[PDB]
Amino acid sequence: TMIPVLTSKKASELPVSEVASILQADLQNGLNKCEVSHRRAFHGWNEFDISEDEPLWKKYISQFKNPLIMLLLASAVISVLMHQFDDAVSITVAILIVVTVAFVQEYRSEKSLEELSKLVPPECHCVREGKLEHTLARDLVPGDTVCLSVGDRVPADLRLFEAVDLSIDESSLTGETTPCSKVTAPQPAATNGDLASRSNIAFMGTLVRCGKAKGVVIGTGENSEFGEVFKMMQAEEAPKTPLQKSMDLLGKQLSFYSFGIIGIIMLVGWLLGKDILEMFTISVSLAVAAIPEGLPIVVTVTLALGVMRMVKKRAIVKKLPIVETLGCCNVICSDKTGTLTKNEMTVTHIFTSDGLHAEVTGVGYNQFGEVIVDGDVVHGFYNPAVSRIVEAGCVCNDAVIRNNTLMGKPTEGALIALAMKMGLDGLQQDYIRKAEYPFSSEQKWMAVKCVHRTQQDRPEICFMKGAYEQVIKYCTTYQSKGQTLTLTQQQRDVYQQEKARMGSAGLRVLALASGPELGQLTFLGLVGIIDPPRTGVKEAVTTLIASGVSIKMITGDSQETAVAIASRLGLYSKTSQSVSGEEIDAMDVQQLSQIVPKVAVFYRASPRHKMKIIKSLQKNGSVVAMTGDGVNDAVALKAADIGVAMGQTGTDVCKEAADMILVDDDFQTIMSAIEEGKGIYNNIKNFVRFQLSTSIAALTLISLATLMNFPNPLNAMQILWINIIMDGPPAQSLGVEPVDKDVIRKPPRNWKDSILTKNLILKILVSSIIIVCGTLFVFWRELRDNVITPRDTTMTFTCFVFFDMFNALSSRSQTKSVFEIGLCSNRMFCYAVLGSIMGQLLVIYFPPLQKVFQTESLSILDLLFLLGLTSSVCIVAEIIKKVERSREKI
Ligand code: BEF
Ligand SMILES: [Ca+2]
Numbered sequence: 001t002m003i004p005v006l007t008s009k010k011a012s013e014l015p016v017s018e019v020a021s022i023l024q025a026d027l028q029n030g031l032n033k034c035e036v037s038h039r040r041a042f043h044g045w046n047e048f049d050i051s052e053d054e055p056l057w058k059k060y061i062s063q064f065k066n067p068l069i070m071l072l073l074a075s076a077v078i079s080v081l082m083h084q085f086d087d088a089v090s091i092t093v094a095i096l097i098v099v100t101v102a103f104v105q106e107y108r109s110e111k112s113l114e115e116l117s118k119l120v121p122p123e124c125h126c127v128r129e130g131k132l133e134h135t136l137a138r139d140l141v142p143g144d145t146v147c148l149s150v151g152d153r154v155p156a157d158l159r160l161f162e163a164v165d166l167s168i169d170e171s172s173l174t175g176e177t178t179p180c181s182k183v184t185a186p187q188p189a190a191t192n193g194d195l196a197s198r199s200n201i202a203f204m205g206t207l208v209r210c211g212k213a214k215g216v217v218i219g220t221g222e223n224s225e226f227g228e229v230f231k232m233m234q235a236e237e238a239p240k241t242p243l244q245k246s247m248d249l250l251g252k253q254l255s256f257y258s259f260g261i262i263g264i265i266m267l268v269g270w271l272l273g274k275d276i277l278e279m280f281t282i283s284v285s286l287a288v289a290a291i292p293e294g295l296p297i298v299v300t301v302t303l304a305l306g307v308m309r310m311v312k313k314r315a316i317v318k319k320l321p322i323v324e325t326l327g328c329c330n331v332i333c334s335d336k337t338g339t340l341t342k343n344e345m346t347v348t349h350i351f352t353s354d355g356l357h358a359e360v361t362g363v364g365y366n367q368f369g370e371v372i373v374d375g376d377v378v379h380g381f382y383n384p385a386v387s388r389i390v391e392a393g394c395v396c397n398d399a400v401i402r403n404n405t406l407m408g409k410p411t412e413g414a415l416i417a418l419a420m421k422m423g424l425d426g427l428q429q430d431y432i433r434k435a436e437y438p439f440s441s442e443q444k445w446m447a448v449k450c451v452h453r454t455q456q457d458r459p460e461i462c463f464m465k466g467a468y469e470q471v472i473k474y475c476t477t478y479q480s481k482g483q484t485l486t487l488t489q490q491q492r493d494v495y496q497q498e499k500a501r502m503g504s505a506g507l508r509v510l511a512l513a514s515g516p517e518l519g520q521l522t523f524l525g526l527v528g529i530i531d532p533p534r535t536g537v538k539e540a541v542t543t544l545i546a547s548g549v550s551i552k553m554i555t556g557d558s559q560e561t562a563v564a565i566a567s568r569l570g571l572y573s574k575t576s577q578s579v580s581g582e583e584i585d586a587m588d589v590q591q592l593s594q595i596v597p598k599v600a601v602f603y604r605a606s607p608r609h610k611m612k613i614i615k616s617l618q619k620n621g622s623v624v625a626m627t628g629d630g631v632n633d634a635v636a637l638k639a640a641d642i643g644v645a646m647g648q649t650g651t652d653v654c655k656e657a658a659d660m661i662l663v664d665d666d667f668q669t670i671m672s673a674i675e676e677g678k679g680i681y682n683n684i685k686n687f688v689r690f691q692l693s694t695s696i697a698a699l700t701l702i703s704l705a706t707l708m709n710f711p712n713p714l715n716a717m718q719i720l721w722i723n724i725i726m727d728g729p730p731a732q733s734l735g736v737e738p739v740d741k742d743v744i745r746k747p748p749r750n751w752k753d754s755i756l757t758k759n760l761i762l763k764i765l766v767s768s769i770i771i772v773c774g775t776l777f778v779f780w781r782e783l784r785d786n787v788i789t790p791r792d793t794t795m796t797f798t799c800f801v802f803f804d805m806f807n808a809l810s811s812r813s814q815t816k817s818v819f820e821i822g823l824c825s826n827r828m829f830c831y832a833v834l835g836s837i838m839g840q841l842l843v844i845y846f847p848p849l850q851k852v853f854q855t856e857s858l859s860i861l862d863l864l865f866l867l868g869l870t871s872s873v874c875i876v877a878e879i880i881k882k883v884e885r886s887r888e889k890i
């Protein structure tokens, strides 16, 4: 009927009896089908939400929610209410074409090229009516009895009542590399403050390392340790991306300036005494043209292109604004347990009793790897000492690795991987174990007795593995260069010094011995077990440091491993300092601001502490790219800027928290994202420059026409066509222009800055001045003596169109010019240029088009003269750009 959802705190406080009776849970019979169904109906399913996928309706509707779109719609309405329908129809057709093309492209391409993000369902074991039933964890109910074995994943919060040497790896939500032993007796309230201190509870999403246990589920759904994190992350209003705010501000400023200039032009015309209707129509057309109606479309196109480029490099970006925020990052955080270093112990250094030093290459529980001693490769039984050490580590073992997954203790898995690297994966099968001494905390050693299966007549050989202090007590002799010599005090001191040196580097020293009987075994050597960083981590870190981006590391694990990992990655200096989470919480934030950017190591931290660190780093002004792979980081990933979550060794919460998903865990992918973002920003800047130059030229031409009271060189239809060309498919083609190698070697962009540079403004002004001067010269040559003809208007329109095409051609690359990118790469820009040229030709040479547009036919000689005249601006622009770049670079 009614069951309270017991938290791990209270459940840990209480014992088995009243916890079981509170939930009406039977420890042996479990729950019946009817009770399970009722609990399912009340509490719901055990799995989390699956979010909501937006259908096409409001996805297409939202494209009309831009303020510029509202302005365009209002302008079209006022145009259709003047009983003309021409400008209204043209504007409606243009906006419909642009919006439909952008919507179909984005929706279809994103829905077709983002179907590789598939997940897998979890598994669990349940007992009902005394029968062990294999059922999914997705249907679990509170009060169920769940059996825990080696290698399985804990399905929910389990109140353990029976446990036999159970070991659970909780690094997913705590970050502690060392597994914590699990007990049955309730914990005191005084020691029940920390999450890891709960040794009598089982957390969801953790992996059982060793032992077997049975527990009763206390909380299923959104009311667990994952549930509280999800509740805290529910709203979690993230800051808006800088690109969107900057684009909105630029668009608003441009619209305000255009409206002011339109009002000034209208006032001047009213004082000049001209036709109010024609002036109003021209002002409306100019207001439509000047404001950027294609800037959001080109931004969306560039973001989609970046998403596809990321996908081609095994990445997932399930939203638009992510692509243009990684390049602005100045500081990058990283979690040691899962992102920089996997949760896998691998032997790296082996010490031999005779003084030989061995280095092991390779990571992971796989046969990949190489063992090199004195610069020579050792495989199989080539080196008797290393072979004996590997045999001791493999035969005296209890863990088995199946399908690159470890079932057993991490050190045993490291030993098995080391044996696999030399090709001795099946070495344990040649010995039949007879007597076993299980490893225990008190003894701190494990010993086994075994004989060869084909050599049973051989005397029994005992292999012992454990701590150096315990193995040396049962050791009396050692092997040196194939000779058995008595172990002396000097050799013991040398071994102790070697162990201390290994420990100073963060290596976990493990001792090995072999002999016929206990108390006589022969020392073989020491093996260094340590969690190693991923192969593609050091190079990426070095590249990021050389790029001018600071890197910080948050550990959440013991201090020694933190400093060792930081030193191995080069992020820690011997003169640097680290601060714990308790000191951060106790000490006031007002002074912590000066201490947050000078440090990069945080051995002890909490999800709320990580969020506080994130907020402090962001409050002074910066963009933070913090990664993560567990629930410990999920809230920090969500409540920050762009975050990258590993999609292989990760949880179902980090994938949703972080937009960037790597199906394969790697770090070099961030550099490609930064380069693509820089290229997208360069393309956006070039498009903005071209649009601003065209708008400024048109505004200056109209102002000059209105000022000295001479007939306007262009009508409403020509201005509308110019606007369509300026902010149409040709405009969107400027953002699809391919990337280059010049902007790649550039340091992170600094925000709170204007996108218009001095050189860009000067180039825009020069282009506008040249276009206006050419148009004025053509006009003066047209109506020179006494003639006024619509052919003059057609010539002016053609000259303006040709100038726009030439400006667009030269604006494709900000630093390159013609004959540098190839010019014949089958460009959508070239296709759009050809289409616009054919449309202009059709308009010029069609009696209906000539009637509506008030134009006239031209001649071949006139076309040749126009082509030869509308080419000076591009040549001089490219020449001045080349000479300026050469003088300022060489
Ligand atoms: F070390 Be992290 F918190 F997984
Ligand atoms: Ca426009």
Ligand SMILES: [Mg+2]
Pocket: 171, 172, 175, 335, 336, 337, 338, 339, 628, 629, 630
């Ligand atoms: Mg982690």
